[PDB]
């Protein structure tokens, strides 16, 4: 649980 996000794609 909890997805890492490099902020490259939205939503």
């Amino acid at each position: 649980e909890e997805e890492d996000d490099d902020m490259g794609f939205g939503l």
Partner: antibody
Amino acid sequence: EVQLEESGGRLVQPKGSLKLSCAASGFSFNTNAMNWVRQAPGKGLEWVARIRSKINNYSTYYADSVKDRFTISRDDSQSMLYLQMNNLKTEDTAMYYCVRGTTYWGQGTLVTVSA
Amino acid sequence: DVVMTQTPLTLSVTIGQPASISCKSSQSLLDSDGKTYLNWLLQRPGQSPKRLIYLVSKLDSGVPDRFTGSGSGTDFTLKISRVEAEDLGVYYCWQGSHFPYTFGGGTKLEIKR
């Protein structure tokens, strides 16, 4: 250190099938969305497919050019990302990169679609 | 699909001099959450691409301050204050605001000598 190693590239006949693998290490594979990006020889980059992590129920996305022919999948227990390609066309010839989000890129594996 | 247009196709710059490259979208990249998902990547010869900038203007870690990203809506720009030998390569813009995630055609930066 972060490492992504793609395996499986090779020569295949038009209409043929091929499965690519990507082995991930040095980061938390199971909490990351992964992508496949390809580049035809001497051409630009083209996004192919995306798979989210287990928290987002492994949602999948595909470019129109590969939708229904390609299947993106993962094996979290083995830190593996896959790309199954069916009914291959000469336009599918490219270097295929495994990508963590938009930031960590593998060295790529070459797929040559030819008679 | 959102069409990403990069100009110029190629440029030739002397080491120490500035460079400026453009990325224009067929529709606004301002997303529903008020953020603009515009990324800039560099692919050096015989190497894999690497991300330099995200969210129009944010620098990834280890990217020198010589790079600046700017713009809004449909018009975006990457600027290099003083080019170094290591900046040689092809620069791509990649939008993540609208599905499918489309790339610009690339701008090849060459070293003038």
